[PDB]
Amino acid sequence: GSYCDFCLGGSNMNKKSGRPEELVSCADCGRSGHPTCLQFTLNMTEAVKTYKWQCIECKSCILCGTSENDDQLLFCDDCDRGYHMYCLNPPVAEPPEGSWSCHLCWELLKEKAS
């Protein structure tokens, strides 16, 4: 069931669009969101569709998995995987406060391109 935390409809019923969609259900508490509503992307939506995703309230560092220094955690808005900027492989300073694509998507990126 669940519903988008923006319209509170469902993954087959948009409350603000009157049409079906597919929310993002957290694998910790169980709250959902419309990808289009979260400003998500296809890789993120797709990613989060098949795996955990975990709402931001239950977030964590795929790297650590403690969400401790979330002040550094990087929310790859391309699957949701969170990494403390200083946890990544090619660490960053702050910049990915929104975009970012983590290593999963990236290596998938480098592979995607041609």
Partner: peptide, 15 residues
């Protein structure tokens, strides 16, 4: 650079 925020996104800002 602005704090308008088209939606909210993750990041969790105190609950």
């Amino acid at each position: 650079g602005l704090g308008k925020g088209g939606a909210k996104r993750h990041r969790k800002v105190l609950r």
